[model samples]
Target: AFVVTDNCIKCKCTDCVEVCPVDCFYEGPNFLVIHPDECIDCALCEPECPAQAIFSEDEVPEDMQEFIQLNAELAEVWPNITEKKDPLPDAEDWDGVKGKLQHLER
Candidate 1:
């Protein structure tokens, strides 16, 4: 399964949702998570993320590993989001910013 990591915590760019053939992305207040069981591993969504926050389970950065579980956990409670939406208000300002996990909204 692909994971949505910390970089997406506050950015929430929905470009990935547009390309997801499985429509496996879940919407949150300030983030999005990919449904682990539903992901087809097609790899379409990864490149679409300007924040470069999506990663395969094995390839996820070490520090962001918690997101692998976070994705699975959050996906269960968040509503499905298949259509693209505007990013967070400060998405550009937050892109590539470090330590964003603390800013993540449930």
Candidate 2:
């Protein structure tokens, strides 16, 4: 299984969504997350993520572990997304900024 991390906040690019074989990703206001129960650990979507946000259950940063819970929690309710779309208006700006987890929009 894998989880989307905080770095994805405000940068909701959908590269990973298109590559996920199981269609396990869900869209959120500022990010996308994988349904923990649906991911197959195939490793295809990992390198496709330009944000470097997806992580294996075992490789997740300790500080970002909350996203595992967050991903599962959000996936239960958010809409599934399989095609790439434009990111946030300021996604490029946010990409260079750090510690924006506190800025996640819903």
Which stretches of model 1 miss by more than 4 angstroms? none
Question: Which candidate leads the pack in lDDT?
Answer: 1
Residue pairs clashing in model 2 are: none
Clashing pairs in 1: none
lDDT of 1 by residue, 1-106 (tens): 8989988878898999989888999999999999999999999999999999999899999888889999999999999998998999999999888999998777
Q: 18-96, model 2: which lDDT tens digit per residue?
A: 7788999998888888998999999888898877888998899988888888888899989999888987888778775
TM-score of each: 0.97, 0.93
Q: Please report how far candidate 1 places residue 69 from its true position, in Å.
A: 0.5
lDDT of 1: 0.91
